[PDB]
Paper text:
Introduction of acidic residues near the iminium should localize the positive charge on the iminium, resulting in a blue-shift of the absorption/emission of the protein/TD-1V complex. Our prior experience with these proteins also informed our decision to maintain the K40L mutant for stability concerns, and thus we pivoted our strategy by incorporating acidic residues into the previously red-shifted template M14. Subsequently, we mutated Leu117 to both Asp and Glu, resulting in a distinct, blue-shifted iminium (M22–M23). Nonetheless, we did observe a discernible pattern in the quantum yields of mutants featuring acidic residues proximal to the iminium moiety. Interestingly, these mutants exhibited higher quantum yields, most greater than 30%. We attribute this to the propensity for salt-bridge formation between acidic residues and the iminium, which putatively would lead to increased rigidity of the bound chromophore, and thus reduced vibrational freedom, which in turn would reduce nonradiative relaxation pathways. Additionally, it is expressed solely in its monomeric form. Importantly, there was no apparent background fluorescence in the red channel, signifying that TD-1V specifically labels the intended lysine residue without reacting with off-target amines.
Human cellular retinol binding protein II (hCRBPII) was used as a protein engineering platform to rationally regulate absorptive and emissive properties of a covalently bound fluorogenic dye. We demonstrate the binding of a thio-dapoxyl analog via formation of a protonated imine between an active site lysine residue and the chromophore’s aldehyde. Previously, we showed the utility of human cellular retinol-binding protein II (hCRBPII) mutants as a fluorophoric tag, wherein an active site lysine residue (Q108K) reacts with synthetic aldehydic chromophores, giving rise to the formation of either an imine (Schiff base, SB) or an iminium (protonated SB, PSB). Q108K functions as the active-site lysine and forms a Schiff base with the aldehyde, whereas the K40L mutation is assumed to eliminate interactions between Q108K and Lys40, an interaction that could otherwise impede imine formation, and is also required to promote Schiff base protonation.
Numbering used by the authors: 1 to 133
């Protein structure tokens, strides 16, 4: 299924700190952030997505249209400019962020009743699993 709508509550988090370090996020921010449970809220209507990543320490939102390139500032994550594109590879939602960092982006897919995602930067991969609330 390509339907990723919902409020998703984190069940599992692996190598979140490696991903943050590959983005050069500072020590203090990483050490606090790696401890935290995350929520992902996805509003999906056709190609149009609104995605919100939250914890007690951040609230990061992005809107996009599948298949439409968009210039993006990554704001309080790592304050960089990238050229972003989100597309479907089968039922995997794939984001590529072109810019200073190699292999930067993410992948999301539904597997069972859960949302799985990969966050990638450089040679680091963070793997997460969320349950639908
Ligand atoms: C589809 C998933 C997305 C866009 C994200 C998953 C995690 C994100 C994130 C983590 C940490 C921060 N800060 C500010 C530490 C921001 C966003 S976005």
């Amino acid at each position: 299924t390509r339907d990723q709508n919902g409020t998703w509550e984190m069940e599992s988090n692996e190598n979140f700190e490696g991903w943050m370090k590959a983005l050069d996020i500072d020590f203090a921010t990483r050490k606090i952030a790696v401890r935290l449970t995350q929520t992902l809220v996805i509003d999906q209507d056709g190609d149009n997505f609104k995605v919100k990543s939250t914890s007690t320490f951040w609230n990061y939102d992005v809107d996009f249209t599948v298949g439409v390139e968009f210039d993006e500032y990554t704001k309080s994550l790592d304050n960089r400019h990238v050229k972003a594109l989100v597309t479907w590879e089968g039922d995997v939602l794939v984001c590529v962020q072109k810019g200073e960092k190699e292999n930067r982006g993410w992948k999301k897919w539904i597997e069972g009743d859960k949302l799985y995602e990969e966050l990638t930067c450089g040679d680091q991969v963070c793997r997460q699993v969320f349950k639908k609330k």
